[PDB]
Amino acid sequence: MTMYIAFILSTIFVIGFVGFSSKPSPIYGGLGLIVSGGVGCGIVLNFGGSFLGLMVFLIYLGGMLVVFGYTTAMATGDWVIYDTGDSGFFSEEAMGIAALYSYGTWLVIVTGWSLLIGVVVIMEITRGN
Amino acid sequence: MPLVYMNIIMAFAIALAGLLMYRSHLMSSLLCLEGMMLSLFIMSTLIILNTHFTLANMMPIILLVFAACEAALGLSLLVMVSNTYGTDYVQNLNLLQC
Amino acid sequence: MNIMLTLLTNVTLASLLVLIAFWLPQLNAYSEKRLPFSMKFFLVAITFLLFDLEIALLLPLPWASQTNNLKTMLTMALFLLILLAASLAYEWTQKGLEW
Amino acid sequence: PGIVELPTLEDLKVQEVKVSSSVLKAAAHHYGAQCDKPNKEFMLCRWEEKDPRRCLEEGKLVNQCALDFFRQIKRHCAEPFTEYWTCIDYSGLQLFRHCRKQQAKFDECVLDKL
Amino acid sequence: MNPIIYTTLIMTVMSGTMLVMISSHWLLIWIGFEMNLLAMIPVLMKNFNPRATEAATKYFLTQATASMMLMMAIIINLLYSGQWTITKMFNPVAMTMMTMALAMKLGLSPFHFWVPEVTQGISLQAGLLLLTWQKLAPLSVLCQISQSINPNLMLTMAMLSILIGGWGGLNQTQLRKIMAYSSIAHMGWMTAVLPYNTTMTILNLLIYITMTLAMFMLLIHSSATTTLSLSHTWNKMPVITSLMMVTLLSMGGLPPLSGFMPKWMIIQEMTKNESIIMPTLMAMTALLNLYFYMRLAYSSSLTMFPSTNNMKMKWQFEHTKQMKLLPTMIVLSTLVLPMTPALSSLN
Amino acid sequence: MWFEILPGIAVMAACLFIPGMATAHIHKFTNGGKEKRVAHFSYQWNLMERDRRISGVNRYHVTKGLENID
Amino acid sequence: PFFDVQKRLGLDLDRWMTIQSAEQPHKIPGRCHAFEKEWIECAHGIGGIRAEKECKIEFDDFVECLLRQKTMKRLSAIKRQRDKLIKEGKYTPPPHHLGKEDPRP
Amino acid sequence: MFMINILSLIIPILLAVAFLTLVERKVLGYMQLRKGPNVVGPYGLLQPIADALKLFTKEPLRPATSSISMFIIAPILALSLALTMWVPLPMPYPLINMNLGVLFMLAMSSLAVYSILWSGWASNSKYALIGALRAVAQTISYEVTLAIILLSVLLMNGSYTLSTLITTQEHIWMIFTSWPLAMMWFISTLAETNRAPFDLTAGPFAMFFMAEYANIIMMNAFTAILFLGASHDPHTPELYTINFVLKTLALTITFLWIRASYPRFRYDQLMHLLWKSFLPLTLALCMWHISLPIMTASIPPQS
Amino acid sequence: AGRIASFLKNAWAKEPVLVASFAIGGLAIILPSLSPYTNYAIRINRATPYNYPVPLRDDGNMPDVPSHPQDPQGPSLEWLKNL
Amino acid sequence: LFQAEKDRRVLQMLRENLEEEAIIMKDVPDWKVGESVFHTTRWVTPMMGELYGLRTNEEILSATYGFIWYT
Ligand SMILES: CCCCCCCCCCCCCCCCC[C@@H](O)O[C@H](CO[C@H](O)CCCCCCCCCCCCCCC)COP(=O)(O)OCC[N+](C)(C)C
Ligand SMILES: CCCCCCCC/C=C\CCCCCCCC(=O)O[C@H](COC(=O)CCCCCCC/C=C/CCCCCCCC)COP(=O)(O)OCCN
């Protein structure tokens, strides 16, 4: 037991949320949120969620917080609850995620329509006049 | 219920409280919302992976997508508010009073 | 462990070599003597964010190709790409990609 | 709410198969061809009983069948099997496709002998 | 905006509400709420001005916070029971957080503060849509999970909503703020009967929606957003003022008007469950809503306020656009008391 | 002439030769003269764990041959 | 409120994702498949109220599988007593728990 | 011996980057009827060492008003990401064998823009901030099409594992299967690293320079692995290493050639290029490459 | 007839990228429904054994279920070898 | 063969843990050695902490994070 590494990861996550929850100098708040997102991604990756952790680290960090900082720039215990068996010759996470195209037709339809409406709504809101 | 889930929920509560404080900078409001969705993603992912709910692996991605879309909308709104005042201060939105 | 050690090594080497670069010329003594907020640049970032979300949706495609329900997955993947193209076309025709 | 029963340490003693995964992969096709009946009985009992404690004898039977299979290989086709599993062991993926020649030697040897 | 875009956004709002209403999976309910939230924002900003932008951003903030709380409640429920179906909540305060999220979505006290501001900022059509259609989905979810709710918290927030609406309506000269406080009080009346009978909640919702539609269409026809601006309507359209006064009396809960039907039934239902004090207090507090309705009626049609000279020119023109459903809405919000037992249709 | 560019390029080539080759040699030295075993999919990991236990020296690379079947 | 379109039309829009034991891809089982199966079978058609009073055993077993509070409590008690005896000095773990066992395939 | 492996990966890349500058100057000079540095050293071989020593012994001009925190952090992030993105690559065997290696590289490349943002915002100047905003917008714009092209190409590989790309191209290169995607990928990699014709924008400056040049070399190496598959024999990986290094050197020299051969775009011109020529073609070819294995019953194995 | 050809000829000039993209997308939509190898791909996906084949308990009334893998009855993969 | 070996190893580890619990809990008044926490008598797959709870830290780290940390 590496002194319950997940415990330290969770504590650092909470410390980061406390750090930018005071909201000092919103770029410093954003950087604290970047560190917190990195810590949470590390938590998910260490748990075993490689694909979902990489989704966090790519989408969240590289797109959403990047756009946040861009707009701001324009302005002024463990190891016990786990399993025993194996997964086969694949990862169950990848199979469940890829099931979105064979099982989740309804989810794909609603999410795609929502994203298209989001694009249209953004255009209308940012039209100005 | 292990301590990690409690830590994540405490993080979410801290983010929500910080959103409710409103020192200034509505951008910080959006930041608090995004911290809240990040905590939601992390804890939902941990719960789903742990119980081996294979079809539930869909849900976090969906959540992320939708939440990020919301952020975009919020950012747009912020710009227009700033586009009227030049700054994103909360107290500038005092025109409407109960 | 190995990935953590590799990241730690890379960060440590970069930090040490930056510090020595920043401190070697500091041992010798020398003289030691706005608003505009363009709106198109915001639309570029927002469009990038939306298209990145749709890419996130598209990502599980390499594993989606082994499901035995090939017709349905092909239909849904083509549907997602069609709506991505439709978003691009709508933003194009509404003068959203101009300078 | 009750006491869980576990078999004694003596009931779990069996002559174990002490060959590595490379040897097992090299012999796997003929092993499945020859040891099908005890393996199928064990797996049927395992999926129907849903209990490790109710399928202990069948594990001993499948171990015995594997040991007999390897004993026949050792008596008749030890050397070509040795080169075949050494080749399989070298590869980091343990791919069959890199030394079809050693596989052909081993397969013709076992076909001629047994 | 482009009429095609407006039609698409309205259809997206309605499709989000229908997705909430027809789905049995919590994630699909959250997705429907997200879709409705996304498509509602431009509708509030059809007329571009800083007031509408402020109202839209306030609404977006409140609704996004409510959605985050809803997701947290869903995830805690999943943690304590691996269920996604919308059923009994299966857990402690996870239900409390679900109730808080739905209360913020509906505008119940103590989360009532955003309703008057958003209603004042937006125009009359946007206010009509906001105060009528945006209540169906959260109320549907609450009706689905009604057996889970703790009666103490729900009844406390309902009584708070009634009290706050009654008191806050007394101080208003703007018509939109009056409508917002009326909505808050009516939602308070609606959610106090959820622990006992959801059919009564739905009946109150139908009656309130009819009355609100009639009131907003009458306000749009005589395009006034202020008490004094409304006081000039008699010099042009006295029949509009008379219909408005009758509708206001109906919204006050006076028998034999239609608006008396819900409260009556609700009170009746609450007496079957050995509850007396709360129905009494609710009636005595709705007296305040009646008072400010009656003040508006005094300023509208029972007295004739001074007019202006240019009004004469307005005498020579007729409304080009006519609302077809306005006559029906008035009759349904005024004269449907004798058809009360039809509530057995499980409306 | 143009071949005077070749020296520096050669240096680059040598610098780009070192990493990959090095890894291979290390993979030969740490994994007992064979290719390093890759473990995705959690079944190859089980195979490696079984190999580690059988050897008795707590190393997956050591291979127990038929000679150990008696 | 709830308009059960899926049952009227037989569409199955989102019922496939509601429970762990409903046709996972590649027949991958949930961690608590048996407990959830038992609890669902017991409570089918009984209704929520009678279901809540009468299927309490199966639901308690399902929750124990999901969160394992009792198992961790028992393990922690055993470990605490072991630590107490090993600090007092009257207990010595066998080589099996010290790393000196003979591992088996 | 994992520390030795990390060091033997990390040091030769830096040496390669130092010598790349000499090659870039030398290659360009001979392309312009002149020579590169040929005085400092036998053939300019000592020029990078003299450059490094002079840059490290030159005074650093700290803005005297900037945030020292981010001013120091930005080069750290740049170097860390540049050196980290080499870990996943298999030459033939990777330092770290990742299941989702390509996705990891995508995430790192997505992070790469924070250094630009922080350098611009800590520069304490409106004009440098405007330039940084332009650079960040261009980078995110082109990484969109990078990601789409990358997943379209990987649809024939069967996974995100980088090693499997060697097995996929054992008989034929990937360039023949899809050359248009390779063309757009090459242009997108040119535009990502702010290289001509897209180059619109003492110690820390050298740090950023080494980070950019290491990113250039890594991008060329990744392109060579992705589209020009080298045959790997398990019993002698040196042949694969030699072939991979030769192809990477050829691609880097091709970048130098393109820099030497063309004028530069305007900002709006490259924006239009991407958003109105690459994205539609990228989406169409993504649809084509989704449907193609299903039409031809040629789906890759791994799942 | 003539108007469509004129429009395509005008689009092939000064807008070739859009013409190529639309053609490729339309072909990607249309072709899979006409190819005969999509069923082959589905069958290939069906024949990939990811799980252990759990044996069936024999009752003497399954003439189509083999008792051993070498028995002739059961699904065959000769067609896949021929591919 | 792997399934049989897995079942045998898991059962043998559980037997060792039961023996150690019987030795340790001999003085605790209300303890019942090897008492199930479930009402059902059906076999339940043991957790990782049920097998490795009393064992040493290094092999706990192995069984928990070896596959995740193997690169
Ligand atoms: C009947 C109502 C029609 C009018 C009302 C429309 C209401 C809103 C529009 C959305 C409803 C469309 C119906 C789609 C429901 C999904 C379920 C159904 O389609 O079956 C699927 C069949 O998939 C079909 O391919 C669906 C194709 C239709 C979707 C493509 C276009 C959708 C656009 C609809 C509106 C979206 C926005 C507007 C775009 C113009 C499931 O596939 P299946 O293989 O059986 O089972 C998989 C499970 N397995 C693996 C265990 C076997
Ligand atoms: C449902 C099918 C989808 C699948 C294929 C498409 C996938 C991706 C392609 C679409 C991406 C989005 C494209 C957005 C289109 C916007 C068009 C537009 O508005 O631009 C017009 C120009 O667009 C047009 O020219 C109108 C249509 C032109 C032809 C479009 C294709 C129509 C059919 C052609 C091919 C038909 C099938 C192929 C057969 C050809 C023979 C092999 C103005 O250009 P500017 O840049 O503003 O110029 C100003 C500076 N001078």
CSV table of C-alpha atoms in Angstrom, one decimal, chain H residues 45-168:
chain,number,residue,atom,x,y,z
H,45,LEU,CA,30.1,21.4,-36.5
H,46,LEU,CA,31.0,23.7,-33.6
H,47,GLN,CA,28.4,26.3,-34.4
H,48,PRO,CA,25.5,24.9,-32.2
H,49,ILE,CA,27.9,24.7,-29.3
H,50,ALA,CA,29.1,28.3,-29.6
H,51,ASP,CA,25.5,29.4,-30.1
H,52,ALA,CA,24.4,27.6,-26.9
H,53,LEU,CA,27.3,28.9,-24.8
H,54,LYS,CA,26.7,32.5,-26.0
H,55,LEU,CA,23.0,32.3,-25.4
H,56,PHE,CA,23.5,30.8,-21.9
H,57,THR,CA,26.1,33.5,-21.0
H,58,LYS,CA,24.0,36.4,-22.2
H,59,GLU,CA,22.0,38.6,-19.9
H,60,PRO,CA,18.3,37.7,-19.4
H,61,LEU,CA,16.0,40.7,-19.8
H,62,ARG,CA,13.2,40.1,-17.3
H,63,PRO,CA,10.5,42.6,-18.0
H,64,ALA,CA,10.8,44.1,-14.5
H,65,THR,CA,7.0,44.2,-14.3
H,66,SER,CA,5.9,40.7,-15.5
H,67,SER,CA,4.6,37.9,-13.4
H,68,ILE,CA,7.8,36.0,-12.7
H,69,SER,CA,5.7,32.8,-12.0
H,70,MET,CA,4.2,32.4,-15.4
H,71,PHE,CA,7.3,33.8,-17.1
H,72,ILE,CA,9.3,30.9,-15.7
H,73,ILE,CA,6.5,28.3,-16.0
H,74,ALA,CA,5.8,28.7,-19.7
H,75,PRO,CA,9.3,27.4,-21.0
H,76,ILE,CA,9.0,24.6,-18.4
H,77,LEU,CA,5.7,23.5,-19.8
H,78,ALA,CA,7.0,23.8,-23.4
H,79,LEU,CA,10.1,21.7,-22.8
H,80,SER,CA,8.1,19.2,-20.6
H,81,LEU,CA,5.5,18.6,-23.3
H,82,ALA,CA,8.0,18.5,-26.1
H,83,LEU,CA,10.1,15.8,-24.3
H,84,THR,CA,7.0,13.9,-23.1
H,85,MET,CA,5.6,13.5,-26.6
H,86,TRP,CA,8.6,11.3,-27.6
H,87,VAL,CA,7.8,8.7,-24.9
H,88,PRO,CA,4.8,6.9,-26.7
H,89,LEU,CA,6.6,6.5,-30.1
H,90,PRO,CA,7.9,3.0,-31.0
H,91,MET,CA,11.3,2.9,-32.7
H,92,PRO,CA,10.6,-0.2,-33.0
H,93,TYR,CA,9.9,-0.6,-29.3
H,94,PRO,CA,8.4,2.4,-27.4
H,95,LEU,CA,9.8,3.6,-24.0
H,96,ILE,CA,6.3,3.3,-22.6
H,97,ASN,CA,3.8,0.9,-24.3
H,98,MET,CA,0.5,2.7,-24.1
H,99,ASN,CA,-2.8,1.2,-25.2
H,100,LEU,CA,-4.1,4.7,-26.2
H,101,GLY,CA,-0.7,6.1,-27.3
H,102,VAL,CA,-2.1,8.2,-30.1
H,103,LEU,CA,-4.8,9.6,-27.9
H,104,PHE,CA,-2.2,10.5,-25.3
H,105,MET,CA,-0.2,12.4,-27.9
H,106,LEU,CA,-3.3,14.2,-29.0
H,107,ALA,CA,-3.9,15.3,-25.4
H,108,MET,CA,-0.3,16.5,-25.0
H,109,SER,CA,-0.5,18.5,-28.3
H,110,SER,CA,-3.8,20.0,-27.0
H,111,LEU,CA,-1.9,21.1,-23.9
H,112,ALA,CA,0.8,22.7,-26.0
H,113,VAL,CA,-1.1,26.0,-26.4
H,114,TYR,CA,-1.0,27.0,-22.7
H,115,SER,CA,2.7,27.9,-23.1
H,116,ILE,CA,1.8,30.4,-25.9
H,117,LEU,CA,-1.1,31.8,-23.9
H,118,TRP,CA,1.0,32.3,-20.8
H,119,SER,CA,3.9,33.7,-22.7
H,120,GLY,CA,1.7,36.3,-24.4
H,121,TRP,CA,-0.2,37.2,-21.2
H,122,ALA,CA,2.9,37.5,-19.1
H,123,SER,CA,4.7,39.6,-21.7
H,124,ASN,CA,2.9,42.7,-20.3
H,125,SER,CA,2.2,44.1,-23.8
H,126,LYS,CA,-1.0,44.6,-25.8
H,127,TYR,CA,0.6,43.8,-29.1
H,128,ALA,CA,2.3,40.6,-27.9
H,129,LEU,CA,-1.1,39.6,-26.4
H,130,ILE,CA,-2.8,40.1,-29.8
H,131,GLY,CA,-0.1,38.0,-31.5
H,132,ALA,CA,-0.5,35.2,-28.9
H,133,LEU,CA,-4.2,35.2,-29.4
H,134,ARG,CA,-3.7,34.9,-33.1
H,135,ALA,CA,-1.3,32.0,-32.6
H,136,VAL,CA,-3.6,30.2,-30.2
H,137,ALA,CA,-6.6,30.5,-32.6
H,138,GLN,CA,-4.5,29.2,-35.5
H,139,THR,CA,-3.2,26.3,-33.3
H,140,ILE,CA,-6.7,25.2,-32.1
H,141,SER,CA,-8.1,25.6,-35.6
H,142,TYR,CA,-5.5,23.3,-37.2
H,143,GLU,CA,-5.5,20.7,-34.3
H,144,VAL,CA,-9.2,20.2,-35.1
H,145,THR,CA,-8.4,18.8,-38.5
H,146,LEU,CA,-5.3,17.1,-37.2
H,147,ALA,CA,-7.5,15.1,-34.8
H,148,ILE,CA,-10.1,14.3,-37.5
H,149,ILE,CA,-7.5,13.1,-40.0
H,150,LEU,CA,-5.7,11.1,-37.3
H,151,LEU,CA,-8.8,9.2,-36.4
H,152,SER,CA,-9.7,8.6,-40.0
H,153,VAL,CA,-6.3,7.1,-40.6
H,154,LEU,CA,-6.4,5.0,-37.5
H,155,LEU,CA,-9.8,3.6,-38.6
H,156,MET,CA,-7.6,1.2,-40.7
H,157,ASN,CA,-5.2,0.4,-37.9
H,158,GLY,CA,-7.9,-1.0,-35.5
H,159,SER,CA,-6.7,0.7,-32.3
H,160,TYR,CA,-4.9,3.7,-30.9
H,161,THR,CA,-1.7,1.6,-30.2
H,162,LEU,CA,1.3,3.1,-32.0
H,163,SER,CA,3.0,-0.3,-32.3
H,164,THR,CA,0.1,-1.8,-34.3
H,165,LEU,CA,0.9,0.7,-37.0
H,166,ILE,CA,4.0,-1.3,-37.8
H,167,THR,CA,2.0,-4.5,-38.2
H,168,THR,CA,-0.5,-2.7,-40.4
